[PDB]
Structure formats: structure tokens, C-alpha cells
Amino acid sequence: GRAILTDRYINRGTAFTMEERQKLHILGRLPPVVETLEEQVARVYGQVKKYEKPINRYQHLVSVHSTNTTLYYATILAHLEEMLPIIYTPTVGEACMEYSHLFFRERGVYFNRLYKGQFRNIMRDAGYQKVEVVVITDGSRILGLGDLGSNGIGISIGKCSLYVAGAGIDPRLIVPVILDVGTNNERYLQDKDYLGMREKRLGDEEFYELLDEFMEAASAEWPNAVIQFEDFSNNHCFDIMERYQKKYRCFNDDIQGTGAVIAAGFLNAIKLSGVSPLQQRIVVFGAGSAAVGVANNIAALAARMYKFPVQDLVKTFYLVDTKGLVTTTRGDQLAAHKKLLARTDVSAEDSAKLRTLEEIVRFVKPTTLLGLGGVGPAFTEEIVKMVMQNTERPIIFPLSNPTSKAEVTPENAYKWTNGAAIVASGSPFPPTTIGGKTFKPSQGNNLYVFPGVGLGCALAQPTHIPEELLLTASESLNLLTTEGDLREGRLYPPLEDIHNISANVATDVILEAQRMKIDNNKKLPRTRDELLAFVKKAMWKPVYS
Amino acid sequence: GRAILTDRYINRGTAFTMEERQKLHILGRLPPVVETLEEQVARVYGQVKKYEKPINRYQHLVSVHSTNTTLYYATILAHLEEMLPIIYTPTVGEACMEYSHLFFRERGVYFNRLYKGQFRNIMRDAGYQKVEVVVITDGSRILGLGDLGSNGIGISIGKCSLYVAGAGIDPRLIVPVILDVGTNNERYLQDKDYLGMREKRLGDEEFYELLDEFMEAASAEWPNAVIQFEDFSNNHCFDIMERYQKKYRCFNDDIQGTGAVIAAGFLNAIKLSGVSPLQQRIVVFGAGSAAVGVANNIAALAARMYKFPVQDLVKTFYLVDTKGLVTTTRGDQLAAHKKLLARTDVSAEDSAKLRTLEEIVRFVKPTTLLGLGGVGPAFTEEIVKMVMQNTERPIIFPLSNPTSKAEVTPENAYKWTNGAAIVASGSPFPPTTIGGKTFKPSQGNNLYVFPGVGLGCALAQPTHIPEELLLTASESLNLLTTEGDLREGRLYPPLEDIHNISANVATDVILEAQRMKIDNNKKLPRTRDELLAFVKKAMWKPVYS
């Protein structure tokens, strides 16, 4: 009766036919209109699209997710490019920050020092079987802005939901986790309505004692699961991966997902440019560990796909930090992560005259500007025009988040080059029309890779996730950009086709794992065509069945 | 486990102690703060009060009601005067009109011609036992504005919730009903997202065939229930009561509740005025059936409480319609409902000179202005000053809904009389300060009577609800205004004390039913002190138990 309607996994609302309503004794529990899923999606979309503020839209979608899980995921997939900034970055962050009450109904798991030694019992008592995907955060944030502490559960809830939408992970087999080790958000510490551990973030030693117990408890109770780290601060995110990458099935989408996605898009940017990889001169504006991680992912992918010597791919890279061009002759002690991309072919005297971007671009004569600075619009009209002198097709990638940090707008880049610029960003931007010719930047969204990595590790059951599976996923994404997409200036397959992309990415990840003999699921086909067809069938679909 | 948390009736959220969380295996399903109900109410109130627009506030409260029923009702009762315009008139009407998706989760029952002959099976299949209160509407509306058709279920949901909050009807024993007989809302008829019967309202004959089947099906399957008609248009609301009042346990709160509440307040206005009931000269501005219903309720209560001859109470009333003073000598055929209050002591020639309110007030010299016009601010400064000439304490009641229709603001009435005016309205208004002296109008809210009528009929099980029980409830409400309240200028007990008011009103209704020997529940005490104590114990309480 009203039990079927109150289970969000099997509830169909108005899609129950008259004759079904009769058999199920729910005649009189619904208005009399009968709708198809398509009609219900158009109705939900209409409801959503009339709300004016993102957080209003998010709140409406949360109520649909609460009542009718199928209709929620069906709505997301029919309008994915539009719904992505509502259901995740950056609306999700505002929702956590100020509307954390929207997450109370959802299936969160909470850990803290008060449950030390009980992490396994908490996981057992959760009563979830054959869990495939666990997103964990501590709410510290990657961009080191707005520590959310316990409210970070909204980030895990949002990320888990993107595995279901993106790769058809079954929504009963995802678990969002908050590991609450305190917060340095001073408003929260004095806020009467903060529900987390009201204390400063624990020191490293107690932090790793709790996270170790979590990783070991998850491996015993959720043995089939992938553990994905989300939105951990820079002080911990890299060290977490060095500590766990080999003993557990885990990855970090911020670090590994981002580089895999940017690399796939950058190589397609190379294909459209005229200028082949060994002919590229690439300014990397910004030299944090993440920016150097992306450069290395690009080198590693170009080596995989084209067997150029990797040393030679590295020499295409000119790294800029806060001081200027990174060189061996400029006279400072370089961070370990910067030595690898330091120029060896630049005198001390030239180094001293290479400090502002304008003069770095004038000397290096780059073919590509990679924006990973997050210090505002450093790619000026004159800097872009200078790149026009060195290539017919400047590759300009303003990837710094959020959009106000970005090095340049797609619109300015397209304008300043008269449509010649090849552009990718993190954020969706509308098309620019230049003399009747339309241009639209490619969105290097992390949704392209983590879902397929998740679905691939769910099926394959690898003992771990070494860099080789992330590289395979990077190449798989590059190779799904068709000749037709490339012809239309797209650097990625279309976002709307995420199920197909995720099936392909998973297939490739599985074959890499099989090849490395780290797979534990022997039921799988070991040839691509059969595997791809099997993977597509294993995927949960947002349709009534 | 997560089953206890997902039942909104027993879920306590953060009020589960640590040791309870352990025993119930929900450690790790909640943030670690433990709160008392009081703390949870202050937190929910804080969340609600930061939203800027009523419909936002309503949407937040709907999510609390969905998760934690106890915390919802606890929040309402701690802030009742503030929450009433959010959870019912007028926010509820806007929610139905444009946000009907907020009602989809709730326990609505839907009837229409397509289920003709199945009304009983629909009620049986609903699987509700010993139902006490059924609110039914057809969405036509009493104020004949914004026909909502099927979306009228939000009105029944809102009204049912006020019986739980107001009188402690158990939330599992209330059933909201929409009888969908079509809609004349032309936007809805052309709206693709309207989910109701897409047709003009049925004719009277098919209307009564469906409503008859509903009344008979309810009497068999919900035998213990009161049936309360809500928000039916004037073409049907009176005729429904004439058709059903004797054969079923039913009332209409718009008609009967309104008059019971206004009468109780008006008599207390008389007590504070100096001018006793036979000395009152009362202008009834507006002469619709509802306005004449209120005048007759006032007469009937004054007769009950003071045994003045009812003919003599009627002669205190000067009825104004669209033409002017209603008299026997003015030369039109008077509607039946107007004959009773027609002046017999006014010549044809005077009648002809008594058409505008200003000159009606100049001739009649009234002590009281009852505003039931709904045609704007007819009680001018000069009209109010004129009443100052005939009494030290003008009784001025602007009761016309919504507040923009009202005959005068409490502020103007208080200003114009220098604090002498005794004021009641339908809507809450803030206090006015006049030379260091504070005044606040009395709110004649229907919440004062229908809950207690509901709780009284739930316990008593009367064969029907004759006018005598409504009169008893009217007197009971008058008599609960204490000497201390009267001393402070209050015409009603305080709204905050609704549980006590509802216990008292129910007790009196039960004794009236026992006295008439129409009660079917023989388990009840038959003396007031014991009955009142029993009634108070039978009431559902918003506390964790």
C-alpha cells in the first residue's frame, strides 16, 4: 500500500498505471494523471527551472531524491550540463556551509575520536552489503577555503550521487562518510547549532590513527568497495595517497582525477593545434603540487600514446611559480616537486630578467598557456596576442577555480585570437559567436573519469589502484573523442553521453588491471568488445523496471 | 538501525542519547552532539527564521515534518503566533497554488468520478484504524479566489496538522482528503503539469452523488471520525451542512468555527466596553450569509449566557448590504437570510437617506462596528470618531480577509480613539504604543474552536454535531478568558495556551453531548473536573516518550 510509495528506490509516483494502482491498493493515494518517466522529468525540470537561486533548485532536487530515486537520476541525466553546478561544485559547498539540514535524511556515516576502536561495529551496524563506492572527506577542503568540519558529509553525499548518475553504480551500494577530526572554522566552534566535534583539527598522529582504523575497518566490512578521498586539504591529501595507495583500493579524485581529465583534453588540443607534442612550448602558470601533478600526467599520457621519450616531453614545460620562470640557474633552493620541470637551458642572467608573465611569454614564445595559478586574470590580451605570433592555434586552458580566479574567460580568449584559441576550463561557459562562427570551450569536468574508475574497480576488484589504471582512464577518455567531435572543436566526448563514457573507461581500467593480474573478479570477459557489453549491462539505469 | 531514524513518528535525531545510540545500533548515523527537544526546537527555529520569504520557511518546516514529527509539532507550539501564517492561511494557499510538489510525500486521499463506486475500497486500502478527524475540500475556496482543484489537498494537509498541534489529535489518526470534481482554474485546465481531473467542475447532481458516496463510505470505514468540510465555495458550503448535519458527524469550520470564535470575543468586548448587550447598537457592515451567520451566533451566545430574550438581542443589530441599511420599508425583496435582521423601526423616507456608511453611522449612532465587508477600509477616521460620541469604548472588529480587504487597521482604530477602541481581527498585528500605553488587538483565530470540537467528538463519539455543541464551544472559549486576561484587554485566552483551551472546549462539548444523550463512548467521566483531567491525558503531546 502506502509502503511501496514510501520506499524511494521502488516508488514511481504518477508512473504507476491505473491497473497497477488497483493491484497495489494505491488507487486514491495519487492524483489521477498517469505519466511516463519522460513526462515526470519534464515536470520536475519545469518545477526546478522556475526557482531563481541555485540553493532553492538544489533543495527541490533533494526532495525528489527523497521520494523517487529513479526520477531524480533520470532528471539529472536529461539535463546534466545544467544540473551539475546545482548538485555539486559550487552549490553543494554553500548547502553544506549554511543548509546542512538538507543532508540529515541521507545515509551518511559519521566517525570521530569518541568512537575510537568501534569503527568496524559502526560499519557492520550500517547494514549495507557488497558496497562498491565509499566517498570520505574530513571537511578540511582542497582549495583550503571554508573548512566545513562535520558539514563536509554533504560533499560525500554529493560525490556518491555523481557515481550513480555518471557510471550507474547502484544507489544502494554507495556510502558517504565524514571523518570528523575537528574544525578550524571559528564561526562553527562558537556556533550553538554546530553538531560536530567542537575542537581544533587533531594533530597528524591522532589524524592517521583514526584514518588508519577507518581504512582497515572498511577493508574488512566493505571488502568490495573503492575508497575515494574527497576535499582533503594539501597538508594531508598527497601524504594520505603515499600511505594507502598500495595497501587499499583507494584514490583521490582532486589529485588523480583532475590530471587524468586535463591530460586527455590537452592531447586533443594538441591534435587540433597543428603543433605536435615535441613542438609545443607550454607555460604552466602556477607550480603547486597539483599543477606539477597535471604537467606530469600530460607527459605520462603523451609517452603512453605516442612513445616519445618522457625526458623530451618534460622539456616542453616551462613552470612559473610566484618568483617567475623555474630554472636551475635562478639561485633559490627549489621544492622537490619543482626540480623535475626546472629549465636547464636558461642562464642565471636571463632567469633574473624572467619574473613577470609578460616577459616570460616574450622570451619562451609558448604555443600553450596552462592556467593553474588561481590569482586572477594573468592571461592578458597582449599575452594572448604574443602566443598568436608562435602558433595559428594557441592552446589556452584557464583551469583555476572558482571562475573569478581563472586566468582568462573563454570569450576574451576567442575574441583576442579571432576564434583561433583552443580553450578548456573546469566551469561550463556559454558559446561565443565571432563573425557568424560559433565557439564553446571544452569543460574538463572530473565527472569524465572518477565514475568509470569507480565502476571499473567495482567489477574488477583490484588489490589496489596503481597509477597505471588512472593513465589507462586518461587515454580511454582521450580516445573516445571521435573524429566528428574533433572536427567540431570538442576536446572530450559530450558530457550527456556520460554512461557510454563511463562504460568505456571502466572496460579499459578492467583490462589494465587484468593485464597487471591485480583483478580478483574472475567472472569478467578478458576481451574488450565482450567486456564493454558486460559492463554496460552491470550498470544501474534510471528507468522503472 | 537506520529503520528507527526513517520512521518520522519515533525518530528523535540528535535527542537519542549516546547510550541509546549504542543499544539501537545508530552510533555513526548522527553527528555526535546530543540535544534535548528544547535545544532541537531552538535550532529548527533558528534555521526557519533565517529564510526571508514565507514559502521558504514553509518548505523548511515541511522537511522537519517529513523526518521528525515530534520536533515539528514541538517547534510549532513554542512559536505558534509566528508559525500560524506560515503553516496555514495565507502561505498554505500559495504553496498549493505554485508548490503543490511539497504535498506529494504526505498521506493525502484522492477521490474523483473515475473511482465512482470504489470510495469504500480506497478508504479500506488506506489502512488507517480508529481515524478521529478527516478534513475534506474540493479546492473551490470559501473566498471564491484561486480555485486550486486537486492542489486543494495542501489545504486538507495543513488543516489536519492544526488539529494535531491545537488539540493533540494523534498524527496517525488524521486523514486529509481531496474530492476532485474538476476545476474552473483556466491556467490549470491548460497546464501540462496539472495532475487533477482536467475538466470544468461537475454539476450539482454529480457533485452530490460523489459527496454522498464519500460521506457513506467514511461512516462505514472511518466510523469514529469527525468529517470537517474546509474551503468549499458559497454555492455548496451551506447546502452541504443542511444535507449532512443530522445523518453524519460533520461540521464546517469556515461557517460554524468562525461564528463561535467571533461571538466569544465579541461578548468579552461587551464586558470591557461599559455598554451591556441590550445597550449595544451594532453595525454589521456586510450582509452575506456568513456575516448574518456571525450576527446570529452572537445573539445565540448572549441568550445562552445571559438569558436575555433572543428577539431583543436581534434588535441591537443594524445590517448594511451593498444598498445601505437593511430595513422592511426600503422597498426591495430581501434575501431570506436578511429578513431576520431587517430594521422594523425605520420609515421608508429615512431608509432612502441611509445608503452610505457615514450617514448610516450618523443616524444609528452605533456602539460597535463589525467589519465583514471585504471591500476595503470603510471604517474612516470620521466614522470611528462618530462612534467615540456614543460610547467611551468603541468595539471595532475589522474581520474581512485578507488584511488588504479589512475595514480598518488596529493602529488607526487605536490612534483615532486615543486607545479607547476594543479591537479584534482574523490576522495577527503588532502592538501599538500611544503615550507610553501599549495596545494589541485580539486575534479571533479559528484555531480557538475546531481543534477542541475535533477532540471532543473524537472522545464523545456523538451521532452528530448539532448547533448546541458549537454554541457550548463558543461559551467555553468566552469563559476561559480570565479576569487577568480581561484586565490586560485580551478578548481570548492566549493562543500559546491552545492545549489547555482545547482540553476545556472538548470537555464542555462532551458534557453538552452527554446532556443531549447523543454520545456513544460510555467510558468517559460525566462530571467536569474528572472529564477535563481525562481529556488532558488522552491528548497526544509533542515530547519524546
Ligand SMILES: COc1ccc(NS(=O)(=O)c2cccc(NC(=O)c3cc(F)cc(F)c3)c2)cc1
Ligand atoms: C517534491 O518531490 C517530488 C517527488 C516526486 C515527484 N513526482 S512523482 O513521483 O511522479 C509524484 C507526483 C505526484 C504525487 C506523488 N506522490 C507520491 O509519490 C506519494 C508518496 C507517498 F509516500 C504517499 C503518497 F500518497 C504519494 C508523486 C515530484 C516532486
Ligand SMILES: COc1ccc(NS(=O)(=O)c2cccc(NC(=O)c3cc(F)cc(F)c3)c2)cc1
Ligand atoms: C531538514 O529537516 C530537519 C530534520 C530534523 C532536524 N533535527 S534532528 O531530527 O535532531 C537531526 C539533526 C541532525 C541529523 C539528523 N538525522 C536524522 O534524523 C537521520 C535520519 C535518517 F533517516 C538517517 C540518518 F542518518 C539520520 C537529525 C532538523 C531539520
